[PDB]
Amino acid sequence: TRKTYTLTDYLKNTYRLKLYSLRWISDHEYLYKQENNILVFNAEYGNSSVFLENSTFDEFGHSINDYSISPDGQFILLEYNYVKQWRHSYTASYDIYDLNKRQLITEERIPNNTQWVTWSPVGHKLAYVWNNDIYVKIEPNLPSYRITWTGKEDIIYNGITDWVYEEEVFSAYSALWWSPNGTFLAYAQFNDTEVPLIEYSFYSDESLQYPKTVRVPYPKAGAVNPTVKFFVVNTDSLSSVTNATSIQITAPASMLIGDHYLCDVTWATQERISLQWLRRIQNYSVMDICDYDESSGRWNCLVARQHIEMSTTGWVGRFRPSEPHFTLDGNSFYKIISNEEGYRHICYFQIDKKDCTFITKGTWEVIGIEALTSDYLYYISNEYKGMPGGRNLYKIQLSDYTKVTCLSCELNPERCQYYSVSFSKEAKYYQLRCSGPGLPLYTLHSSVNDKGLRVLEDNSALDKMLQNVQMPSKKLDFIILNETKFWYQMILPPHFDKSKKYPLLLDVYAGPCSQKADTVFRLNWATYLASTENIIVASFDGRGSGYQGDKIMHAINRRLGTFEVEDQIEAARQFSKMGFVDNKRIAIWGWSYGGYVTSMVLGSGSGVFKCGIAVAPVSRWEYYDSVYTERYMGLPTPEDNLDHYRNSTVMSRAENFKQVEYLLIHGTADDNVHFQQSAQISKALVDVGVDFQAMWYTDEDHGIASSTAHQHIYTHMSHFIKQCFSLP
Amino acid sequence: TRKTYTLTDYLKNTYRLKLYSLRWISDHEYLYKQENNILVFNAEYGNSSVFLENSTFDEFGHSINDYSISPDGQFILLEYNYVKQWRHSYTASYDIYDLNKRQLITEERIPNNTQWVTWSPVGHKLAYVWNNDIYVKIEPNLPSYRITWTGKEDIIYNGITDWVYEEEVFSAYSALWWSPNGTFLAYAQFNDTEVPLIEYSFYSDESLQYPKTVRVPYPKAGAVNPTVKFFVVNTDSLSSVTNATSIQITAPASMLIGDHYLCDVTWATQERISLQWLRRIQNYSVMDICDYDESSGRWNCLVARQHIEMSTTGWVGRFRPSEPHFTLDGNSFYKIISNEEGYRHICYFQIDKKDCTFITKGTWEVIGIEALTSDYLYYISNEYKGMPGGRNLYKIQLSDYTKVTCLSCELNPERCQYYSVSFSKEAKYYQLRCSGPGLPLYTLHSSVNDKGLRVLEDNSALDKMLQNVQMPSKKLDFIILNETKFWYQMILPPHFDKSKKYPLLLDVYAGPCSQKADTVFRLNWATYLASTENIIVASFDGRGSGYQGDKIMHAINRRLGTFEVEDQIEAARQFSKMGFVDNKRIAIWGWSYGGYVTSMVLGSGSGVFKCGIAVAPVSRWEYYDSVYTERYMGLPTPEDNLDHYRNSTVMSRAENFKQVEYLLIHGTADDNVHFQQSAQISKALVDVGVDFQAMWYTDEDHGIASSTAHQHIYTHMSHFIKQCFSLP
Ligand SMILES: *[C@@H]1O[C@H](CO)[C@@H](O[C@@H]2O[C@H](CO)[C@@H](O)[C@H](O)[C@H]2NC(C)=O)[C@H](O)[C@H]1NC(C)=O
Ligand SMILES: *[C@@H]1O[C@H](CO)[C@@H](O[C@@H]2O[C@H](CO)[C@@H](O)[C@H](O)[C@H]2NC(C)=O)[C@H](O)[C@H]1NC(C)=O
Ligand SMILES: *[C@@H]1O[C@H](CO)[C@@H](O[C@@H]2O[C@H](CO)[C@@H](O)[C@H](O)[C@H]2NC(C)=O)[C@H](O)[C@H]1NC(C)=O
Ligand SMILES: *[C@@H]1O[C@H](CO)[C@@H](O[C@@H]2O[C@H](CO)[C@@H](O)[C@H](O)[C@H]2NC(C)=O)[C@H](O)[C@H]1NC(C)=O
Ligand SMILES: *[C@@H]1O[C@H](CO)[C@@H](O[C@@H]2O[C@H](CO)[C@@H](O)[C@H](O)[C@H]2NC(C)=O)[C@H](O)[C@H]1NC(C)=O
Ligand SMILES: *[C@@H]1O[C@H](CO)[C@@H](O[C@@H]2O[C@H](CO)[C@@H](O)[C@H](O)[C@H]2NC(C)=O)[C@H](O)[C@H]1NC(C)=O
Ligand SMILES: *[C@@H]1O[C@H](CO)[C@@H](O[C@H]2O[C@H](CO)[C@@H](O)[C@H](O)[C@H]2NC(C)=O)[C@H](O)[C@H]1NC(C)=O
Ligand SMILES: *[C@@H]1O[C@H](CO)[C@@H](O[C@H]2O[C@H](CO)[C@@H](O)[C@H](O)[C@H]2NC(C)=O)[C@H](O)[C@H]1NC(C)=O
Ligand SMILES: *[C@H]1O[C@H](CO)[C@@H](O[C@@H]2O[C@H](CO)[C@@H](O)[C@H](O)[C@H]2NC(C)=O)[C@H](O)[C@H]1NC(C)=O
Ligand SMILES: CC(=O)N(C)[C@H]1CC[C@H]([C@H](C)[C@H](N)C(=O)N2CC[C@H](F)C2)CC1
């Protein structure tokens, strides 16, 4: 009897998934790490060479966290002393190694505790942020030019984002942008002077006598937001003037009337930058296209080049206005926007004409634009077979839009339905990444003829190991509700038998534009629960989910905590009605938004669920950040949406929790969804006499991803689920 | 057939113990609040009159928290707007009602947010502290005089104690001491300038968007302590034109040489005051006796009247040097101190004589001196029947120490073996409060011939109700360990059958000088556990416990977390060998110091315990305050006792928790044993892969006593214990 996929297998990673991570360094060569060695590969033939011997930095005296080769291949940036901050931010030390001289640079070194560093897009210029100020080095071993002097910890951020901009807007810590050839350096300046601070204790090692109080500028819903400013400095003039002038580009009058955000920066050409701004009421955004004026040394944005983007049904963009992709001459660009029918498609824009032309359409959506050449635009969409949970690479001819070729659909339709791509520098080659439903498969392709060059990694090793294991299966399908299709997936136990009644665990997330029903292959907790515990783990994408049009996505506009919560309940009913579900053993669990929804469901009084687990849940929207929360809920004021803000809290449902078994979990150092959110849930439950299970994780954040905590929480949750299901 | 004492009975207080709290106002009368009325009783005959009508303040407009009649009966202080702070501290608003003119005073009223107020011991003067400064009012309706001007929140405390002095030294918020007739007002001043602050979050009601951060000057082991100064002011010579003059009384040189504490202030006569100082290394204290000089107007403390008290085996006193009891003329005094055999007895001191004479002796201890006349000294001791857990009132003839008379021993030996007492002004009368082993019995007596005048409260109502309930019994006995006997108590289930096997819960505290095996009658969680769940709840007093001499109490000196932990395991080990104990079902639980011992036991590797519960435990001594920790552990430096500080932690024992079920509980707003302590325990368990149960209580402090949390914690713990024991 073959063994099953156990909890230990998941926690110890016995069945390891292989991947192929490469870095394009040109139009036909890429870097690949193999046995601490860094090899360079010729895309066209697959032949390689040792680029950087693994013994090159033995006597460095430091463990190297990561490396970065300058665009011209002349130097290598070595990162060490890595110290994580939020989701993207961290501090580190850096050394620069001269590849030619093969010596390590020891003069004018990058400062320790550098917040961010980046090579210019061409050559080997460096820009970095230290103590909240920007600096630039024209040559690795020469003195830096200070760009800003206003830098101030927790107050003024130059070239780097504050907490909310890092997390909700740019998904990056950096806030600087080199022009295409590196002449200009643009950046944003965030001012958090009046932004309230979230404060929580950090206990650290046992040896710390007094706990530390972490303090971070974090704007909760309706609170004072940070303000922002944008600038551009000409780095080519740095060695000619004592203090180079950072030219400011002010936001349009339509944004200056109130609170607003800088939400996108994209260079069009060497002398043209585009910026998108968004009103604090995220249903109106403006894109400025600015040109350098060589005579005044200033930047001007012609109103005839200004593009407006608004929404009547919801907010703008999936999570923010989409980025523009400019054609080489910078006179036109492509951008994904939802059409008249509410589906996101590629629109072609002339920079000085307000009406764009859609080049794609249909009841499906474009996920992202991946590359653009003078002849073709390549993109990923979920058009194939009408599966919103699938993803494929497409190629559309710019001189004839009726010519669209799917480059990935038919490569291996049974094993691969969820693709990702990585083009080389001039899109001459591309690596395809298949992530499901079968084992991931990585392949390399030639753009000139779209022919497959070779397989890079097929995961045969794992395929062999999984042969002796009773792996569960996955079912992706849909049910119809109100004449609308809604997708779901089920991780079914091995030897599944429709004639039996299985206990069911509803795995939920359900935030706006989410998708929990896809064709991706995963080895996770649900795998163990299905394979070893014979539990059916299901997920449903109802109202509010994404990639299926604005009619479904904007259904929860200004109404979080309603429809996406109800559809999840309805989904469980529908499932039990399928006849292979033990109606007496139905659980639900989720993390983050998933924990909120799980909590809301357990407190609805539906009677459908027996027990549930909420990890790091949101409990009341006024505790979450302004940018994310307000986008879907507007402002928490009586003149706007306060009533629904006060009506969608978990706490007000405390009483119904007497009907279920609940396990509440939260990391104490969660900087994202503050431990405060669970502290208020527990207090509310204690106040109405409700018993439940709880667990805090000392010094863990929203991810509770430290090696030990990760194993501990899933172990703890397994016991709770087995117990609720009366399983040995 | 009849009911049992259930968990709801404990939580809802179905069975209430009646009390009789009176207040002596003279040597002949006392106040007793009845029907919300204040009656004055004549001790000799028992007749009374109404002193103040419950309806008198019907239209007050504020909920009166408490009252306080001036010594001369002319005024009454009304307390309202009560807001709790720490264990004894709080702020409130006050109003004074003139009992003569039946009118509420409206001129020059005490400020709101007053920190402490107190009448002069005689007459009707007032002294209060507001905004950390001292004020005095000679008359209720007259403008107060400002005594101090250095008051500064969290920095300078005048007339009130800081966090550590409140909790660990004075067991009071007040730091004011009126001379016997009210002429002088002595006060202490605390400076916490360099005392680090403990910081933690307070979430408050759901409506508070941002968690609040509480900051409290709290010196942990080895940290910078607050400094103290002592002053005395003449309240008979205050001027409304000039600022009151305070005379300082510096501490002795043997104290000034290093860190020290003021630990006792006791007026001897109208013009003599005594003070005891303790060195930071708590085994050396000095009592100064100071006399007022009418010529200079200073206070002189003659070196010839200096008294030293030191210890070679541990610290001084039970929790600090004992208080002196001066004779009328103030030329001699009585003080409890451990004799050469290590037992605490009453010693007689001449103020200018170095040697004191013991007036009691034997293998038992005096608990406290209760009253003194020229002919007798009245005290409480555990001498009767050699039971260290019993308490009785005795009087000893000051002219012949061989004549000791027990006054409570024989009153009712079956029902009463534990007494406390309350004497009237000149000890003409005394109230006896019996609290075990039977129901509490309150009686009144006359001193002249020790007549038993009358029964004030015998709890016959409760006795009648308890008859319809299957109440558990209590066994008090001792086991031997190395020729030394150690006492324990067992709360046994109804109809105890020695031929059956009962699960056993070890209820432990075990801090230094503690006692958990006594004759006191109690209705608590254990009552329910034994009466309804048939669980034997036992407690044991081992090395480190009090009232049995220094040989036992000082056994854990400089070694907390060793013998007191081992002895609990030995006791349980011995209980398991008894025929009525199911050695497969033995648990342990404790709170505070008991949470620490319980945790140290569960992590001992003994194998004796199946499960255990720790509520707000200490996890490592460096996290607890200086005054209490150093008393028993010395300083946490390598030159002193750091090595033992480091291996007496719970954390270092994480690994051993694999074979037990552990439930860890703690309130997040605990200002005493910081949540930090449990946060480090959970992190250490997570780090070694040990699963356990946990529960935090939002905004609850060390007592977790708010009505809802109290019910919730005991409910939750009950489920845990019943599950550990396989109980329906
Ligand atoms: C991959 O192989 C190619 C061709 O085999 C290498 O190209 C070299 O091109 C130069 C041109 O000046 C010739 O002199 C060399 O003899 C060629 N090498 C070989 C093996 O033919 C290319 O350098 C190789 N790239 C890597 C990364 O190994
Ligand atoms: C960041 O924004 C704050 C406003 O919140 C600016 O501070 C003000 O600066 C002006 C001009 O010096 C002063 O008159 C005000 O008193 C300041 N207000 C506050 C609340 O401090 C600050 O100058 C901005 N910093 C930068 C670099 O732009
Ligand atoms: C470089 O130029 C900038 C901009 O002129 C200088 O920044 C100003 O510094 C002065 C005095 O230090 C302040 O009063 C202004 O508020 C600053 N303006 C800005 C935009 O920061 C900077 O100090 C100059 N550095 C040097 C070395 O001259
Ligand atoms: C990068 O682009 C910039 C901007 O076009 C170039 O700088 C200009 O160069 C022209 C000469 O071709 C001069 O007439 C302008 O005065 C320059 N403008 C500025 C703002 O510097 C730069 O030469 C380009 N770099 C490279 C390597 O081609
Ligand atoms: C409280 O005791 C003080 C001190 O013994 C009394 O004050 C003294 O009284 C005598 C007689 O009137 C004066 O000659 C002294 O000069 C006073 N000394 C001081 C320091 O004031 C006071 O009278 C007593 N108060 C009461 C109410 O008995
Ligand atoms: C009071 O207790 C302290 C602490 O034990 C004693 O001081 C010294 O402590 C160190 C540390 O163990 C020993 O090495 C010394 O032998 C102790 N004695 C001295 C004089 O330093 C101190 O002796 C105790 N005082 C009394 C009166 O017993
Ligand atoms: C208790 O009873 C006595 C009488 O036995 C009361 O009487 C004494 O005090 C009264 C006023 O306080 C006077 O009217 C009596 O003359 C006086 N008698 C004696 C013998 O002292 C006494 O007041 C009563 N006490 C209370 C508190 O009611
Ligand atoms: C309270 O204690 C502080 C700390 O010792 C006293 O001030 C002292 O410490 C300051 C900062 O540590 C120093 O800057 C001062 O020089 C030092 N002495 C003085 C007189 O400030 C402070 O005075 C004390 N306050 C009172 C009212 O006693
Ligand atoms: C302490 O606060 C109370 C309440 O504010 C003061 O009492 C009065 O309260 C009323 C409203 O309830 C106000 O209109 C008055 O201004 C307050 N003062 C008076 C004299 O009525 C109280 O006076 C305050 N105590 C002190 C010493 O100022
Ligand atoms: C895809 C994209 O471009 N962006 C910018 C995303 C915007 C939402 C981010 C989180 C999901 C969210 N910030 C969070 O942590 N929540 C926790 C509470 C609530 F569920 C949201 C992740 C990046």
Ligand SMILES: CC(=O)N(C)[C@H]1CC[C@H]([C@H](C)[C@H](N)C(=O)N2CC[C@H](F)C2)CC1
């Ligand atoms: C009897 C007496 O005179 N005094 C001054 C006592 C000294 C200890 C005090 C607490 C018991 C202690 N402070 C505490 O809360 N701990 C928690 C950790 C440790 F168990 C002690 C109570 C008053």
Ligand SMILES: *[C@@H]1O[C@H](CO)[C@@H](O)[C@H](O)[C@H]1NC(C)=O
């Ligand atoms: C590169 O270094 C790794 C780790 O030190 C080692 O396993 C490997 O043998 C080295 N490369 C080669 C080709 O041996």
Ligand SMILES: *[C@@H]1O[C@H](CO)[C@@H](O)[C@H](O)[C@H]1NC(C)=O
């Ligand atoms: C970084 O820190 C190390 C360690 O203290 C120090 O030796 C080195 O000189 C520092 N480098 C820079 C650029 O400051």
Ligand SMILES: *[C@@H]1O[C@H](CO)[C@@H](O)[C@H](O)[C@H]1NC(C)=O
């Ligand atoms: C933007 O959203 C606000 C809030 O609902 C609304 O009042 C306004 O009309 C919206 N503007 C557009 C163009 O939909």
Ligand SMILES: *[C@@H]1O[C@H](CO)[C@@H](O)[C@H](O)[C@H]1NC(C)=O
């Ligand atoms: C005073 O009020 C209480 C209720 O607060 C009431 O029970 C009692 O009867 C009243 N006292 C008198 C003498 O009526």
Ligand SMILES: *[C@@H]1O[C@H](CO)[C@@H](O)[C@H](O)[C@H]1NC(C)=O
């Ligand atoms: C009393 O002393 C304080 C403290 O400096 C001073 O501010 C106040 O003015 C003084 N008042 C008189 C009358 O001297």
Ligand SMILES: *[C@@H]1O[C@H](CO)[C@@H](O)[C@H](O)[C@H]1NC(C)=O
């Ligand atoms: C006596 O018993 C104690 C515990 O009560 C034990 O620790 C000690 O080693 C034994 N022997 C002596 C000589 O004290």
Ligand code: NA
């Ligand atoms: Na009697």
